[PDB]
Design a protein around this ligand. Structure first.
Ligand SMILES: O=c1ccn([C@@H]2O[C@H](COP(=O)(O)OP(=O)(O)O)[C@@H](O)[C@H]2O)c(=O)[nH]1
Length: 442
């Protein structure tokens, strides 16, 4: 292959997944692929015989928990010299007829821009969160001087934000609840994304059409929107063993009778709220498949606080599944999600309507957009209460009053499918991306 692309993900599941989906999309278009990766949380290299892996940067920190994410600031602050040596030696060791076209990194690797610059290597960024999230980010000054960033101030919560009517004030509070902490790294990510040679968004035009103008205005480099879950699932980059019972169980369930439930990799709840969630599921009387990661419940290894047989025959709790493949199964009627972007987009691409909870960061923004703009789910935006949970589940899955949500999800899946076909917005965006990358050396 004449042209090689180097991709460098952040080593967590929700960041590895889109990068390796993109790597496959680019390999399909004729590029050779080198993955730079930490030894930490490395994927199964034997699932990618067509890729070359080069392990870097970590050849005392915990492997799990919120402290695991400390690797990202540390590598941003201390990895430049090593990344440069690794990039330069690969650039030098290339075949006579081969050329390294560009580096693609997670936007969170803001340190890679100066490194790539110093080698005259173009860097493109893969955004793993939405255009709407970015639009909210760049509106933070206007939020600030309206005081919305004031955790000890608790007013106008249910009001729409002025100048940003798609959001409520509480959404902004929740999303930027750690602002004073994160404003530094957030600012660096945005700066070095704007300074990049191109931004790839895991999205599609018909999903976030209200946001395109913002990214054209705010980012000089070209933007490309590609809905990676419509190209392929992320099953090959799973860091955990998929549960081997769920599909046999799903085959025993009537169509659209199952609520899939997963609250995310790092989310955490009190025992009180955990039990209230369980009560709401039982009260809904719907069948459910619930992925609970060990540690989800404060103070318990897994799901100890659940009483024996409390979930009855209608429910299953597992630790890990191939999520997009589950969402594609005919038994699934709805998805109760924490509103992480991969999960939300997977559900959209499989046409599954959603019930939304959130645990901060971009999740409240995703829930608000999907529930109020697209109207493909119900946002539980006032905590955990068994009656409200049961009503939301049933509205999406059973009630005739929720038909519009179910139909809106079906229509949006069809729009994603159309965007991939020749002539569609995603197809042409990918065509532009391939031509752009191919042009970078001339
Ligand atoms: O049992 C599970 C739970 C999650 N996922 C995948 O893990 C990723 C989770 O990313 P997301 O952005 O939704 O949220 P996070 O867990 O990073 O907060 C998605 O690709 C899911 O399909 C999976 O394959 N199986």
């Amino acid at each position: 292959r004449r042209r090689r692309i180097i991709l460098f993900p952040v080593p967590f599941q929700g960041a590895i997944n889109p990068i390796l989906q993109l790597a496959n999309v680019l390999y399909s278009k004729g590029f050779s692929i080198t993955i730079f990766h930490t030894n930490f949380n490395k994927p199964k290299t034997s699932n990618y015989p067509h890729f070359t892996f080069r392990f870097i940067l970590d050849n005392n920190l915990p492997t799990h928990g919120p402290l695991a994410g400390m690797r990202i600031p540390i590598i941003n602050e201390h990895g430049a010299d090593e990344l440069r040596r690794e990039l330069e030696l690969l650039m030098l060791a290339s075949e006579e007829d081969e050329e390294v076209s560009c580096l693609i990194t997670d936007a969170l690797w803001y340190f890679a821009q100066s490194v790539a610059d110093s080698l005259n290597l173009r860097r493109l960024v893969l955004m793993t969160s939405s255009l709407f999230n970015f639009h909210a980010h760049v509106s933070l000054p206007q939020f600030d001087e309206l005081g919305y960033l004031d955790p000890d101030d608790k007013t106008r919560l249910e009001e729409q934000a002025s100048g940003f009517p798609m959001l409520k004030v509480k959404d902004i509070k929740s999303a930027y609840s750690n602002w004073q902490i994160l404003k530094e790294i957030l600012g660096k990510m945005i700066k070095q994304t704007k300074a990049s040679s191109g931004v790839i968004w895991n999205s599609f035009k018909e999903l976030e059409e209200s946001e395109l103008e913002t990214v054209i205005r705010e980012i000089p480099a070209p933007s490309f929107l590609i809905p990676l879950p419509k190209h392929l699932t992320a099953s090959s980059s799973s860091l955990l063993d998929h549960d081997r019972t769920v599909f046999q169980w799903l085959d025993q369930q009537p169509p659209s009778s199952v609520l899939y439930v997963s609250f995310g990799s790092t989310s955490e709840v009190d025992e009180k709220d955990f039990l209230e969630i369980a009560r709401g599921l039982v009260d809904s009387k719907q069948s459910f498949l619930w992925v609970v990661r060990p540690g989800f419940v404060k103070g318990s290894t897994w799901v100890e606080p659940l009483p024996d047989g409390f979930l009855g025959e209608r429910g299953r709790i597992v630790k890990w599944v191939p999520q997009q493949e589950v969402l594609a199964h005919g038994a699934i009627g709805a998805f109760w999600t924490h509103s992480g972007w991969n999960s939300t987009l997977e559900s959209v691409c499989e046409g599954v309507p959603m019930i939304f909870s959130d645990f901060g960061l971009d999740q409240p923004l995703n829930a608000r957009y999907m529930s109020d703009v697209l109207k493909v789910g119900v946002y539980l935006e006032n905590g955990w209460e068994r009656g409200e949970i049961a009503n939301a589940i049933r509205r999406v899955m059973v009630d005739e009053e929720g038909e519009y949500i179910r139909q809106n999800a079906r229509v949006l899946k069809q729009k994603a499918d159309v965007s991939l076909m020749k002539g569609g917005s995603s197809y042409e965006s990918l065509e532009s991306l391939v031509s752009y990358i191919s042009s970078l050396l001339e």
